[PDB]
Amino acid sequence: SELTLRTIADEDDYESYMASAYSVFLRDPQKDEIEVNRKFTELDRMIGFHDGKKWVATTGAFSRHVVLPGGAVVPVAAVTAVTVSPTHRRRGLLTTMMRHQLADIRSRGESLAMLFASEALIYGRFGYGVATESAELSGQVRELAFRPTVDLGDGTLEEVSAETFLASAPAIYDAVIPGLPGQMSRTPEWWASWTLDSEELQKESGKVRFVLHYESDGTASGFAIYRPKPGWNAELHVQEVLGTNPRSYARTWRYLLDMDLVRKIKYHGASVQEELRYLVANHPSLECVVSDAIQVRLVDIPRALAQRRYAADVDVVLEVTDDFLPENSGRYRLRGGLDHASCEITTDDADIALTVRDLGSVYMGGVSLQVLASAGLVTELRAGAVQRAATAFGWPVAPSAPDDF
Amino acid sequence: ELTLRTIADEDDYESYMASAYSVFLRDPQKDEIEVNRKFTELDRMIGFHDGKKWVATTGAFSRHVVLPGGAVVPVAAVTAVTVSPTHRRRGLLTTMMRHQLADIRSRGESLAMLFASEALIYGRFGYGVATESAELSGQVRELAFRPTVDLGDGTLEEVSAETFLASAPAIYDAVIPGLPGQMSRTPEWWASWTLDSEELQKESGKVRFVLHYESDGTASGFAIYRPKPGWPNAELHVQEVLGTNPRSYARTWRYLLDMDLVRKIKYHGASVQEELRYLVANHPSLECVVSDAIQVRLVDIPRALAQRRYAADVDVVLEVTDDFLPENSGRYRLRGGLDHASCEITTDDADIALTVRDLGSVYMGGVSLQVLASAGLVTELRAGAVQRAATAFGWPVAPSAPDDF
Amino acid sequence: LTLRTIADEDDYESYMASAYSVFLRDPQKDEIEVNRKFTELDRMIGFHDGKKWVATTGAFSRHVVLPGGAVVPVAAVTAVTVSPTHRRRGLLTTMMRHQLADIRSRGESLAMLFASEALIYGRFGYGVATESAELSGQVRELAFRPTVDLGDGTLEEVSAETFLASAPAIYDAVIPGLPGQMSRTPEWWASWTLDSEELQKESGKVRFVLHYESDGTASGFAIYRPKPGWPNAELHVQEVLGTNPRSYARTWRYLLDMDLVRKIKYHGASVQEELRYLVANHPSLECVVSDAIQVRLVDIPRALAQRRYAADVDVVLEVTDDFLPENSGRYRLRGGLDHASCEITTDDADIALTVRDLGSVYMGGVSLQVLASAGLVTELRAGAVQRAATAFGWPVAPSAPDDF
Amino acid sequence: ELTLRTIADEDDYESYMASAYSVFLRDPQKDEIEVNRKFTELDRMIGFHDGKKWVATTGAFSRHVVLPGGAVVPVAAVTAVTVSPTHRRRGLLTTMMRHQLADIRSRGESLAMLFASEALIYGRFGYGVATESAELSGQVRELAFRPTVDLGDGTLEEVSAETFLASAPAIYDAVIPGLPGQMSRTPEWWASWTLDSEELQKESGKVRFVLHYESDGTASGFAIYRPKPGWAGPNAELHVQEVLGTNPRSYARTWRYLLDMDLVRKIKYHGASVQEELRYLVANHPSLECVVSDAIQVRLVDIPRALAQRRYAADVDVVLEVTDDFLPENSGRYRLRGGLDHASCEITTDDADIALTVRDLGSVYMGGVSLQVLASAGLVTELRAGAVQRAATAFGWPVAPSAPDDF
Amino acid sequence: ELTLRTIADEDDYESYMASAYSVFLRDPQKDEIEVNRKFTELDRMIGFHDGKKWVATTGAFSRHVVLPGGAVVPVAAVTAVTVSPTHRRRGLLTTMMRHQLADIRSRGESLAMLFASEALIYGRFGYGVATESAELSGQVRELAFRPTVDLGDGTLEEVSAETFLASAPAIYDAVIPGLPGQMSRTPEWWASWTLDSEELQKESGKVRFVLHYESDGTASGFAIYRPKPGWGPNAELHVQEVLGTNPRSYARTWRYLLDMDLVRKIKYHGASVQEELRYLVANHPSLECVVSDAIQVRLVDIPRALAQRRYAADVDVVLEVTDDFLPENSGRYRLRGGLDHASCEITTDDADIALTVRDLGSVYMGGVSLQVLASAGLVTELRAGAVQRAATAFGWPVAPSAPDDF
After folding, report:
1. Neighbour count for residue A33 (Cβ, 10 Å)
2. Of A129, C15, D24, D229, which is most buried, counting CB atoms within 10 Å of its CB?
3. Contact in structure between B87 and B259 (CB atoms under 8 Å)
4. CB of D407 within 8 A of CB of D79?
5. Which residues is C73 bridged to in the sheet?
């Protein structure tokens, strides 16, 4: 079979392309999600191999924008639909698609690519490093009272339709995400996918429901997305809770936790430092399971390092090795702080030796460079450099998982 | 008719400990009671006695804890906090803690530490959760390391407790200056930590000890673990693994993971940033459950803040409120960095308002001050203060739980 | 917020949709449509915020069998919900005052409410008066005692239409001796026999059995659903009744000897279901007892005079009604097997109790003596509680009617 | 008033099948009823009708089965054996089977075959369990092969049902002469075997087809399987329906394809042979659990012809005193002389060597049950020394019989 | 420094066995170690010692096994195969097995046998799985027999170990000539098999013994089992062994266990895959049957081993045998065998079948068909028709079964 590397040509090609990706993951095509995700799909970013009659490998990317530590919003390739047919494994198709993709990503001005760890077929390859984690939070709602000093405010709550939700939630989201690195901008089209009452999740629980929190003056200041799972021990499956101030956030959670016929609540994909964890008076009642979320592939190292901000002053020379794309290998001087950042090639002595994968892992402040060094994955060349750089690459607010893609 | 008093003699000690186990619905563990007597100070074991039996207890061990920066300071290790079920909610627990904190203050100890598993006083009296632990587990067949992990030329021997105790203290003493939260281990504390307790034999099996030797014969790592034979589901329950360099640590874990007839491994009480988590190539194969470990009660706030070091420079004024011990309330100027730290009463404008409980929570660098502020528990009074203070109160190495007490 | 009743059919479906939504469920369209046929819109009250319903409380006009066989009108309260954004604001209490007042003005002396209406469990003077049993076990372990006469009867699996031509007459014949059961019009039979999608997913399509005497007379029936194996095939019995002991036992034996069945379940049976005593080895038939029907007495003197009593009783009851204080008072009850009267008196009181606890003992399913030993009922003169407890009992325990 | 009759028309056919599914506590599977109609002969589908509904059923398909030695003989594939619960234990099952067995012999079929899952007549009427099946399962990561197993240079493609049916029949036809118990598959039987039944979609997922190609392009192996995506930890499963190959390399390579598939945790093959080659390819047998259970029951209706139609693992000259309780006209004393290349059977007056029932004779007929074990159990009686041992070996076969496609 | 040596004295023995249990993640079973010493030959227990503890072990018992055809030949019962986890993949297992197999051959033992539960060397060194066992289990209420099964006039008695040991050996000795794979049981081996081990007491209960008597008083059957009391009601019986000298005593003894009052479930681990109980039960689906490996065979003297057993039918085949671990056994062998004869010698005639010594061992006890190994690609047919004839001859009408544990 002669394989052709090409992009999606038309709409029937798109549906066949997406059908093959679901098939590799042992799943039927989710037609409702395929239709709503088409609205922000760029066909010339959806590449793959075709054997003349079917798609045998895929790799796509969405043009998105991600918040960096410090609040800067930079373009990012949201990589998705990474599959190879099981009949075509270990034949170079994944490598070829990824080489073409990273080259196209770099030419578009995107300094990095981001990829959910659940894209298991390329986990930990090609320079992708796990940079963000998520927490699954769960527990009995009767055991999740808040600490008494938590102010709930004078707010009110209303369960509303999707249309009403989408008229207020975007403004709330836009206001909070500058302080939540890892979150991504949501156009109207991305909100449509994020709030879709997908058939897949209805079967797991129930129809999606939307809540809005109002200040006393009527201003929308919080929202929640969740699904009920009636008893078969009724459960609430929370998709997202956000608020522009601590009272609306706490009041919205208190609303979900005080619902009468509910026994258990679950929030998959929360931040490992979700404020809910610290509102609860008795932490052992709220289980916290931590796992991978987002992998980062740095594609333009100097621009990426210069675009984010750093928790403290740092002046360090990094000997960066890029095994997959050796043209990115080089020795860079990083000068950064809270309000400034620059990165340039230098011939001075290197302070730290590390790979582009490990550099990507620490880029969002969710993985300590010091721990990678203590593990033997990163090498300190001059005393005190790793400790100072680890603090600077960290951030007081942990990165969190964006909406699924 | 109740008397507040300390333990008088050896029969009094055994009755005292028996009542503590009884409150927790357990028979007295004679082997643990016997070995822990060797470092028990009777005049630090207080309680209520009704004339014929003990009805409430609260004890403390004189220990020494590593702070962020490596300084080892004296600390009261609070233990045996019980109240009889017929005397609950009558003020006995509060009275015992007032006397205990006063004695701790009178001994010059700037802080007390308390395991969160002391459920009867969880979150009371100004104690704040400052350290977490992770339960790590998974199928050993799925826990291969990343290929760049150097295992070194080391060798391993399974040894008796006596042989283990001839090498493990020197290894432990060398690594803990970089592991805040760990406590000094005298010979007597090693005897308890390495006790082949009957309780844990029933959960799995007899304790076993491993030593890792460098090529020159130098002991550089150790492991404590118990096997749980199949009931094909044989498990290893790891109690502790440490090494003085990345190679010995990785080689010792590889030894446990490659052991024949082993199916599953479990490490309860690891660090949430346990080096093993980043050695494993496929993170989803190693489940990570995060929970409370150590609560901190600051007893001398200025001295405690001046004893630790800070991840970056900080100059912040803290308005501290102590509800339980109002004599500690006041306005303190903290000036600290990597190599210096001072804390003093000041009349300058306050930057941050918080309780002594929340101050204790961030004290070991395991809880972000920024998250406590975003939750509404801490109040920022002047712009930018919390972010700078949160970074400084953090640490590149997360604190970890010491040996149980 | 506006307190009002249902206006039309679009208002009705939105009203019912909100009730399911409060209970975290999608609307069951098939059940909503079939239940409309016995719904009176002016008995369906709720709160409306201008665009949606935020609270509901309804009632069906039904008739229930009392101890002794008397059939009295009763309000079958249903659809008690409040939106989660409007909880703890008095809406449920307001609706219940209006409903109980309307119930009293309609001449209904009492209200009945399934305990599964968890949102108002144990409030407003409702007391648990009837229990139900979930019976289950392996069919191969449920042989009957040898003296059980199965008779000469025959069985046929038949369609719903044929079932509805004979089951009402069988039902109407057995319920005079089964307190707690309610009359079933054609509309209620239509709901009771609905092949609901909800229950199809739990098991399978509804099936109907008729038991015929040797002369051809239908004398028993069964409603059940199969749950094929996923060996562990189950039968989910909804109801089995017979006009004589042979038809009842023969119909159960039919279900228990079915070839591919492993386990059987009867949820909502009587705690004194005769099946429990036909089985030779009781431990093979598990019996889990739980609340079924709550009673709210609305006109106390009329209610006690309508039922009959297992033995003679002459007692003075000091009744306290916290929710509806107009019913509070001191009542003299004189009752027996064939007579019953009740009126206000000024004589010395023998027993002090609430209307809730009075409602709990009203159907003979809860012993007044047990309520007294617990401290909920207070004896004022010696020996009164024992005599009243026996009289308020009944040789046949009350049982749960068809769901509403 | 009950009438024993055959299916009359198409509405009658659907009511007949509807009653059979109802007896087994199931709704009618419309898709399976429709595709199985294509090889259903209405005059072989008998039952009892009370004037308004079917109250008992028993059917038979005209099929052909491979015997030890490779001979393909006509066989009655008995199916749809049901009785209404209100008419059980009244002789209806016995009557239908008497009529069916008589009809089977007149059609030239020397034997009938019946899946053990037809629980209503398990072990009755002279049916004896003659073939077993194995449920194979395990973690795919633990199922590496022995290193000396040659996978060959072959290639694999996941393909549609239409393309699958263009190559799979030829592969099947080539291997089954060496797999006693397998049945010929016409296009109509392939259509049922490859149906993406709604029933099995709910248990796992949509059916999938794999073809193995040699280096020259020749199709030499195939697989039918269904994915069961994950639903605690990850646990995606593969439910294998069938894997066959014309050579050891295509067979092993096709299994290696299923076992190395990404995102798979567990694999299951229900209805495999108890001597499935996969069991011996796996390096670590304890990783592949093997549960053995009944598969096919055999009812011999023409005893002399049946023994003369199969071949025997070694030479045998034995006199069998056969007792047939249900059909006493088959009772008699038969001399069997058979081997690898010859077989004959006729009534004889010589002294009998072995006494046994036709049920027990049917159990050993396919080489899946040792005649020696039946004797040690007390079910078969040896009349002259050494007879059972020689007859047991000859009635055996180096390849165990295996379950055919479901019917 | 490591030393390869045998056990020197009794304290050395207990330290040796302690290390073997430790490798298998277990505390030493003192009661089993004591009773098994009585038939342990110290000079057959080899291992590696580092100067202060044992770091590797491999032992062998001198036993005798019944072959297809009834011949009872000496066999090495290999046991206690361990290596410390700190000494893995350094050649210790290979060295111990080279020395052990060489000693086995010099002692006149034509083969070695090894339980598959010795997981550390599963499938290595030429050992091939030759025998399987079945775990049989089900609800006793569902296990009625076929009606034509004659139970006889026998009687049953629950007896003490001493009373059991006065009759069980004679019953056992009478049935095993027809049960290939079973091994002779001296008094010392009976003592281990009937030990009321603390390990099995914890899994269920104290061992119990049953004897079946004919009408004339003759002991004709026995059973070994342990009760597991209820902990829904669910008391279990764990059967260790049931044997009878005739079909009636076997069936009656099983009927006794299945009709025992207050029992819900019965389990027989380590039965034959052709255990007679499977065919007595009227409804096979009520008796679950899980088949797994039992005994591995290592042929060390190929010509004598092939000549010592008998074959189900005549065979004249030339075997090209490859022995990778012990290449001195590699060669081309002509096997001529039948029901009453067997001979084997090296030949230069054309080979008919090519196979390894491991696969040859797998088919040796009649529990694995050579034809299936050939269809799997593990065995190669060189001339047409050879495998089919050889497979039948290597089979046997009675399947091999697992002996008592060692």
Report:
1. 18
2. C15
3. no
4. yes
5. C63
Q: Is there a single domain that holds both residue C323 and residue C255? A: no
Q: Which helix (H) or strand (E) holds A273?
A: none
Cβ count within 10 A of residue A286: 23
- The partner residues of D115 in beta bridges, in order of sequence, read D296
Same domain, yes or no: D288 and D143: yes
Distance CA E131, CA A93 (A): 46
* Any D CB within 8 A of B232 CB: yes
Q: Are residues C341 and C210 in the same domain?
A: no
**Residues B21, B142 within the same domain:** no
Whole-angstrom distance, CA of residue B350 vs CA of residue B331: 7
D151 touches chain A (CB under 8 A): no
Pairing between β-strand B54-66 and β-strand B72-83 as defined by DSSP bridges: antiparallel
What distances in angstroms separate CA D56 from CA C157, C158, D88, one per listed residue? 14, 16, 9
- CA of residue E126 relative to chain centroid, distance: 17
* A208/A323 same-domain check: no
Expressed as residue numbers, the domain containing C385 is: 297-395
Quick one: A127 and A137 in the same domain?
A: no
Spatial distance between the Cα atoms of C324 and C355, rounded to a whole number of angstroms: 9
Segments of B100-193 assigned E as strands? 111-115, 128-139, 155-159
Looking at the partner chain, which of C155, C228, C258 has a beta carbon nearest the beta carbon of D26? C228
Q: Which stretch of DSSP H or E encloses residue C248? A: helix C245-256
SS (H, E, C) A216-261: CCCCEEEEEEEEEECCCCCEEEEEEEEECCHHHHHHHHHHHHCCCC
User: Of E371, E295, E309, E318, nearest to E338 (Cα)?
Assistant: E309
Instruction: Please give the single-letter amino acid code of residue B288.
Output: C
Q: Strands (DSSP E) along A17-161, which ranges? A: 47-50, 55-67, 73-84, 112-116, 129-140, 156-160
CA distance linking residue D141 with residue D149, whole number of Å:
17
Residue at a domain's end among D236, D263, D294: D294
The verdict on residue B401 lying in a domain is no
- Secondary structure (3-state) at A343: strand
Residue with tokens 């009785």: D83
Active site positions of D, annotated: 122, 407
CA closest to A373 among chain B residues? B246
The span from the CA of E22 to the CA of B226, in Å, is 11
Let me know whether D154 and D287 are in one domain.
yes
Report resolution in angstroms.
2.2
**Rounded Cα gap, residues B95 and B58, in angstroms:** 10
Residues 269-308 of D with CB under 8 A from B: 286
The distance of D283 to chain E (nearest Cα, Å) reads 8
Structure-determination approach: X-ray
Residues of D in contact with C258 (CB under 8 A): 85
Coil, helix or strand for E373?
helix
Question: In this complex, do E233 and C283 lie within 8 Å of one another by their Cβ atoms?
Answer: yes
For residues D363 and D378, give the distance between their C-alpha atoms in angstroms, rounded to a whole number: 15
Q: Which of E72, E15, E4, E77 is nearest to E40 (CA)?
A: E77
Last residue in a domain, options A281, A297, A313: A297
Q: How many helices (H) and strands (E) does chain D have?
A: 12, 17
B272 contacts B398 by C-beta, under 8 angstroms: yes
Rounded distance, CA E244 to CA E212, Å? 8
Residue D310 to residue D73: CA distance in whole angstroms: 9
> Which residues of C are catalytically annotated?
121, 404
Which residue of chain A comes nearest to C21, CA vs CA? A228
Q: Give me the half-sphere count of Cα atoms (radius 13 Å) on the Cβ side of residue A374.
A: 23
Identify whether residues C160 and C228 lie together within a single domain.
yes
The torsion angles phi and psi of D136, rounded to 5 degrees, stand at -105, 135
Helix residue spans in B107-160 (DSSP H) = none
Chains E and A in direct contact, meaning 3 or more beta-carbon pairs closer than 8 angstroms: no
Give the residue among E289, E125, E365, E130 at the shortest CA–CA distance from D285: E130
3-class state of residue D316 by DSSP = strand
Domain tally, chain C = 3
